[PDB]
UniProtKB/Swiss-Prot annotation, chain A:
Purpose of the protein: The proteasome degrades poly-ubiquitinated proteins in the cytoplasm and in the nucleus. It is essential for the regulated turnover of proteins and for the removal of misfolded proteins. The proteasome is a multicatalytic proteinase complex that is characterized by its ability to cleave peptides with Arg, Phe, Tyr, Leu, and Glu adjacent to the leaving group at neutral or slightly basic pH. It has an ATP-dependent proteolytic activity.
UniProt-recorded name of the protein: Proteasome subunit alpha type-2
Record-linked Gene3D superfamilies: Glutamine Phosphoribosylpyrophosphate, subunit 1, domain 1
PROSITE patterns for the chain: PROTEASOME_ALPHA_1, PROTEASOME_ALPHA_2
From Swiss-Prot, chain B:
Gene Ontology process terms (BP): proteasomal ubiquitin-independent protein catabolic process; proteasome core complex assembly; proteasome-mediated ubiquitin-dependent protein catabolic process
Name of the protein described by the UniProt record: Proteasome subunit alpha type-3
Covalent link location (Glycyl lysine isopeptide (Lys-Gly) (interchain with G-Cter in ubiquitin)): K87, K186, K218
Additional notes on this entry: Present with 17100 molecules/cell in log phase SD medium.
One matching Pfam family: Proteasome_A_N
Subcellular location: Cytoplasm; Nucleus
Phylogenetic placement of the source organism: Eukaryota, Fungi, Dikarya, Ascomycota, Saccharomycotina
InterPro entries assigned: Ntn_hydrolases_N (IPR029055), Proteasome_alpha (IPR050115), Proteasome_alpha-type (IPR023332), Proteasome_asu_N (IPR000426), Proteasome_bsu_CS (IPR016050), Proteasome_sua/b (IPR001353)
Organism (species): Saccharomyces cerevisiae (strain ATCC 204508 / S288c)
Curated annotation (Swiss-Prot), chain C:
Modified residues (Phosphothreonine): T44
Origin species: Saccharomyces cerevisiae (strain ATCC 204508 / S288c) (Baker's yeast)
NCBIfam families: PRK03996.1
SUPFAM superfamilies to which the protein is assigned, alphabetical: N-terminal nucleophile aminohydrolases (Ntn hydrolases)
Major localization listed first in the record, in broad terms: cytoplasm
Other notes: Present with 16800 molecules/cell in log phase SD medium.
Role description: The proteasome degrades poly-ubiquitinated proteins in the cytoplasm and in the nucleus. It is essential for the regulated turnover of proteins and for the removal of misfolded proteins. The proteasome is a multicatalytic proteinase complex that is characterized by its ability to cleave peptides with Arg, Phe, Tyr, Leu, and Glu adjacent to the leaving group at neutral or slightly basic pH. It has an ATP-dependent proteolytic activity.
Cellular component GO terms, alphabetical: mitochondrion; nuclear outer membrane-endoplasmic reticulum membrane network; nucleus; proteasome complex; proteasome core complex, alpha-subunit complex; proteasome storage granule
Location of this chain's protein in the cell: Cytoplasm; Nucleus
Record family assignment: Belongs to the peptidase T1A family.
InterPro entries according to UniProt: Ntn_hydrolases_N, Proteasome_alpha, Proteasome_alpha-type, Proteasome_asu_N, Proteasome_bsu_CS, Proteasome_sua/b
Protein name: Proteasome subunit alpha type-4
UniProtKB/Swiss-Prot annotation, chain D:
Leader sequence segment: none
Domain of life: Eukaryota
HEAT repeat positions: 134-166
Subunit structure: According to PubMed:12973301, colocalizes with nascent proteasome. According to PubMed:15778719, associates with proteasome core particles and also forms a complex with regulatory particle-core particle (RP-CP).
From-to range in the entire protein, with total length: 1646 to 1811 of 2143
Domain commentary: The bromodomain-like (BRDL) region specifically recognizes and binds acetylated histones.
Note: Present with 2600 molecules/cell in log phase SD medium.
Subcellular location per the Swiss-Prot or TrEMBL entry: Nucleus; Cytoplasm
UniProt protein name: Proteasome activator BLM10
Transmembrane segments: none
Family: Belongs to the BLM10 family.
Task performed by this protein: Associated component of the proteasome that specifically recognizes acetylated histones and promotes ATP- and ubiquitin-independent degradation of core histones during DNA damage response. Recognizes and binds acetylated histones via its bromodomain-like (BRDL) region and activates the proteasome by opening the gated channel for substrate entry. Binds to the core proteasome via its C-terminus, which occupies the same binding sites as the proteasomal ATPases, opening the closed structure of the proteasome via an active gating mechanism.
Residue ranges of the region described as Bromodomain-like (BRDL): 3-87
Length: 231, 232, 227, 166, 250
């Protein structure tokens, strides 16, 4: 029964993640259920904290209500006690605990998604985690989930060294996604986020030098196309 | 439960002889813990997890053989019992009492048969000033048992034999560090043992006085004691 | 609804347990396989369990199942001293234990206990020995002596033809003399196999060690061979 | 010719592993005995006498009083097996030992005595032969019925059952 | 030989096409398959006897409590799962004292009985309207016998089903079908307590196909005067001896 949910994960659009020396990167494709639909109204790559993002493979809805339940747990169980935001390791723990309970609870099915959660905490540095429907979670240098899972996972072993700059890992995760792509391949059908330098540009305010802004940045429709030309 | 049998238990008791492989050896002046890591991919991040060796308090620690997500649910509640017995009696919790406290939650499902038993089997290594150094075991049966040396998980029946062979009561701590590695010569499905398939721990008579240091080994420190024979 | 009888089966398979009343003393006895070579000797010799300062209890069954009883009891033992200031009477400690295994069937629908228990000791002040037995059903019975457990039938047969009410083992010493013989029949090595505890009037419970148990076995098998 | 260890070396190796305590250690001792009886497909009538002699001496120490449910567990295993992997007449002492029945009292104002410290083992040999050796003029004239204990009343019954099938 | 089977056997708290609740029709056959118990009523008291059935010299009979006090004026005898009736009795002793407190009088035997039935009438796992908190029909039958000053001496049969009848003399348990047809023959509106003490033994002798003593029979009675006493083994014996003679008459 957990086994059947991992199966809904095995199909459903491919997504991936790559840790580097100075950043993390996660991406998936935006398969348009129609051309009539405006694909900018749905986000497969969601912000959890300004230091932490997430992507999935599988059941759309189960991801949404998991991204919501997940943002909240970041406050209710960490920020409202210690004044900081949670560290990747622990926010991940609190999500696994959330899914692991849909498993061992009666009257409910587990979630139809595997999650890739990427982020940076001051003490543990960068890290990238996978969370399964089983509630188990593992730390990755890089991996992929979904259909293209096997092709891409093999390409990542081939191309990954522990000396990658974040720009190198963006480059990789675009190629990796180019071979699996189901629909068209541009900035309107690729979602890519990074966990890099602090972006003060994006704080919304200026006056306390101790807080410096989001590490999580979601690349614009433009930034993507720009990289795909010099590709 | 047909012949006097605990079915849903044997189910998970033998699901244990699949995952992991863990060992505990009590020396005369220290204790030792050790484990092999699950089927690893090249890209899995070695150093982070500490996935099968968890600290419970500054004086107690457990080795796990079983489902990870399942033991974390237990350990979380055991790290707490520790601290409740502090805030309450202002003394560090005695090992047997912590062990029984878990064993009793395990057996809690072994009977209120409306929820599913526990994966997971524990070796506990701890010190308390009432019963010197201690070594314990915890199958989801609900039972715990005393041990001078022990093992859980795959290839269990096998190591118990080499252990019975090379063990001596006068044993030091470094002598027992070897016995543990040495006898993960056999009980290893992976031909040749690496520092990365490992996780280690010690509770010694302190790096200084008459007291008690605890030490979960960092990867490098393993490749260093592996150096003593294993691989070089 | 039949699951009761199945549990009563696990009783059978477990550490063998016995007990024996006397002219003014009581004794238990029970346990299992010496040591699997490498196990810690000195940290679970908890064969018979102390309930109050004057009441003890052994069991045949799932060792992991007993503990939940040997607590719920050790507690009501105090919560009686507390709300009535008066140590529990051996019949009442017994009726409370049995009455719990009973309520582990007929409500909610949950599993019953894999233990039979024997419960001994002297009521407070009164110096008349008491011995009882419980089983997963909810039944309590008083016995001049009894056994439950593995190969328990061999022992109950032995005892019946070795105890008589007309003359109960008066001597403290000799009352144990008998409880030993009766387990030597079913053990699997001897003294190293099963041990004993001993309670005498007024909260005087003194459990026996290894060395007092072999000034017995090796003073039995002396008179034995003499034919 | 090839070893020269003399049989009196396997008699120690055997008496050696008999700790009334260690079970897996006794099982090695009795694994040894069953070999000395499968070692008559091997010459020397002067060794087959050193062995018949060691065996009546050993079964004495072991089975003639002082017997745990751990030994009984082992020896009784031998009785069901040995007579099926070797004709037991390759030994004068071994069989002519279990059938030496100094064991069945008759009334109870004592402790009657002891056990199926035999009955169930003599039986499991007679069960595995079922045909061969069964001259037992004795046993029939020697059975009890009157016995006070059950463990014996029942066993005297389970034996007669087997004595009749033969 | 052969096999008869309906498709509505089994069914838990659901109606057969006839209106039968077989879960409870069966609850009622297992009274017929426990210890024997017999109650007879005179105008001079009520007698309750049972079958002890001691299974050893060790086991000191009397931990075999199949007859127990309820208030000084009400006793009951039980056939069946004596362990399953611990709670059924607790509620009756509690109801009888509770009534004595709230009203300064002994509680009517009729109403003490009905109260016990109203307890086993809370059988189920799903009830809307009023909640019936418990799990299964109560697996034991009761002979309840006592004395109140309205309606003389009384005997009652409480069934697991929650209903009851007031027999002038009833038998339940292993022998009942037969013991009952024998009471139906030998009972009259003018028995004396002495006479019934004995008739209860005669009918235990019969449907036990054995010779009886104090290790297998317990006698108890309830008089207006002395209350509800259980005969100690001595008195149960010269009551037995007194029959060995009375029947050697012809």
């Amino acid at each position: 029964q957990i086994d059947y949910a991992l199966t809904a994960v095995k199909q459903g659009v491919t997504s991936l993640g790559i840790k580097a020396t100075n950043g993390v990167v996660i991406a998936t494709e935006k398969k348009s259920s129609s051309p009539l639909a405006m694909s900018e109204t749905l986000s497969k790559v969601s912000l959890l904290t300004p230091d932490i993002g997430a992507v999935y493979s599988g059941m759309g809805p189960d991801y949404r209500v998991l991204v919501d339940k997940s943002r909240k747990v970041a406050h209710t169980s960490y920020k409202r006690i210690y004044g900081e935001y949670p560290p990747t390791k622990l926010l991940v723990s609190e999500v696994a605990k959330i899914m692991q309970e849909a498993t061992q609870s009666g009257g409910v099915r587990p979630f139809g998604v595997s999650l890739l959660i990427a982020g940076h905490d001051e003490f543990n540095g960068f890290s990238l985690y996978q969370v399964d429907p089983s509630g188990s979670y593992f730390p990755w240098k890089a991996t992929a989930i979904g259909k293209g899972s096997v092709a891409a996972k093999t390409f990542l072993e081939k191309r990954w060294n522990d000396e990658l700059e974040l720009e190198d890992a963006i480059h990789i995760a675009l190629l990796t996604l180019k071979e699996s792509v189901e629909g068209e391949f541009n900035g309107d059908t690729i979602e890519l986020a990074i966990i890099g330098d602090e972006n003060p540009d994006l704080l919304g305010y200026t006056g306390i030098p101790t807080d410096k802004g989001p590490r999580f940045r979601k690349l614009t429709s433009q930034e993507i196309n720009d990289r795909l030309e010099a590709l | 439960s047909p012949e006097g049998r605990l079915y849903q238990v044997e189910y998970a008791l033998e699901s244990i002889s699949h995952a992991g492989t863990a060992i505990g050896i009590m020396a005369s002046d220290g204790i030792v813990l050790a484990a092999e890591r699950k089927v690893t991919s090249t890209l899995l991040e070695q150093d982070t997890s500490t996935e099968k060796l968890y600290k419970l308090n500054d004086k107690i620690a457990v080795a796990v053989a079983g489902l990870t997500a399942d033991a974390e649910i237990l350990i979380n509640t055991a790290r707490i019992h520790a601290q409740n017995y502090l805030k309450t009696y202002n003394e560090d919790i005695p090992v047997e009492i912590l062990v029984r406290r878990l064993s009793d939650i395990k057996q809690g499902y072994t009977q209120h048969g409306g929820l599913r038993p526990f994966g997971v089997s524990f070796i506990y290594a701890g010190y308390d000033d009432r019963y010197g150094y201690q070594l314990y075991t915890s199958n989801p049966s609900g039972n715990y048992t005393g041990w001078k040396a022990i093992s859980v998980g795959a290839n269990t029946s096998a190591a118990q034999t080499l252990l019975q062979m090379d063990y001596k009561d006068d044993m030091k701590v470094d002598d027992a560090i070897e016995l543990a590695l040495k006898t993960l010569s056999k009980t290893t499905d992976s031909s040749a043992l690496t520092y990365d398939r490992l996780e280690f721990a010690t509770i010694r008579k302190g790096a200084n006085d008459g007291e008690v240091y605890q030490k979960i080994f960092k990867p490098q420190e393993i490749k260093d004691i592996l150096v003593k024979t294993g691989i070089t | 609804i039949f699951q009761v009888e199945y549990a009563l089966e696990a009783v059978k398979r477990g550490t063998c347990a016995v007990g024996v009343k006397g002219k003014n003393c009581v004794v238990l006895g029970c346990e299992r396989r010496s040591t699997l070579k490498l196990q810690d000797t000195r940290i679970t010799p908890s064969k018979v369990s102390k309930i109050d300062s004057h009441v003890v209890l052994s069991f045949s069954g799932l060792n992991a199942d007993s503990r939940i009883l040997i607590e719920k009891a050790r507690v009501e033992a105090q919560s009686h001293r507390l709300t009535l200031e008066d140590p529990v009477t051996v019949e009442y400690l017994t009726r409370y234990v049995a009455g719990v295994q009973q309520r582990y069937t007929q409500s909610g629908g949950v599993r019953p206990f894999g233990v039979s228990t024997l419960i001994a000791g002297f009521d407070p002040r009164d110096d008349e020995p008491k011995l009882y037995q419980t089983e997963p059903s909810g039944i309590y019975s008083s016995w001049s002596a009894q056994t439950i457990g593995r190969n328990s039938k061999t022992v109950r047969e032995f005892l019946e033809k070795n105890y008589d009410r007309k003359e109960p083992p008066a001597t403290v010493e000799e009352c144990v003399k008998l409880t030993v013989r009766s387990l030597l029949e079913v053990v699997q090595t001897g003294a190293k196999n099963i041990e004993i505890t001993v309670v005498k009037p007024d909260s005087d419970i003194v459990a026996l060690s290894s060395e007092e148990i072999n000034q017995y076995v090796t003073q039995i098998e002396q008179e034995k061979q003499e034919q | 010719g090839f070893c020269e260890l003399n049989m009196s070396d396997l008699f120690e190796l055997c008496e050696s592993y008999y700790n009334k305590d260690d079970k897996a250690s006794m099982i090695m001792s009795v694994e040894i005995v069953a070999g000395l009886v499968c070692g008559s497909k091997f010459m020397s009538v002067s060794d087959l006498d050193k062995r018949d002699t060691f065996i009546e001496n050993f079964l004495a120490k072991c089975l003639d009083y002082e017997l745990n449910h751990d030994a009984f567990e082992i020896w009784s295993t031998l009785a069901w097996w040995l007579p099926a992997v070797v004709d037991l007449r390759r030994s004068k002492t071994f069989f002519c030992h279990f059938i030496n029945a100094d064991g069945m009292f008759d009334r109870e104002s004592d402790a009657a005595t002891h056990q199926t410290s035999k009955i169930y083992m003599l039986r499991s040999i007679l069960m595995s032969m079922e045909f061969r050796a069964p001259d037992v003029g004795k046993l029939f004239d020697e059975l009890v019925f009157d016995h006070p204990y059950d463990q014996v009343r029942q066993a005297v019954a389970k034996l007669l059952t087997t004595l009749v099938q033969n | 030989m052969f096999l008869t089977r309906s498709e509505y056997d089994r069914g838990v708290s659901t109606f057969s096409p006839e209106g039968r609740l077989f879960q409870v029709e069966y609850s009622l056959e297992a009274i017929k398959l426990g210890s024997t118990a017999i109650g007879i009523a005179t105008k001079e008291g009520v007698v309750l006897g049972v079958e002890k059935r001691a299974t050893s010299p060790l086991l000191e009979s009397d931990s075999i409590e199949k007859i127990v006090e309820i208030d000084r004026h009400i006793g009951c005898a039980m056939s069946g799962l004596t362990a399953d009736a611990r709670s059924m009795i607790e509620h009756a002793r509690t109801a009888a004292v509770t009534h004595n407190l709230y009203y300064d009088e002994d509680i009517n035997v009729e109403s003490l009985t009905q109260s016990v039935c109203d307890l086993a009438l809370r059988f189920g796992e799903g009830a809307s309207g009023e909640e019936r908190l418990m799990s299964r029909p109560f697996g034991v039958a009761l002979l309840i016998a006592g004395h109140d000053a309205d309606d003389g001496y009384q005997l009652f049969h409480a069934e697991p089903s929650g209903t009851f009848y007031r027999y002038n003399a009833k038998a339940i348990g292993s022998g009942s079908e037969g013991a009952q047809a024998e009471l139906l023959n030998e009972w009259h509106s003018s028995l004396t307590l002495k006479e019934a003490e004995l008739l209860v033994l005669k009918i235990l002798k019969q449907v036990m196909e054995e010779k009886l003593d104090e290790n297998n029979a317990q006698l108890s009675c309830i008089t207006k005067q002395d209350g509800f006493k259980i005969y100690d083994n001595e008195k149960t014996a010269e009551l037995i001896k007194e029959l060995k003679e009375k029947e050697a008459a012809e």
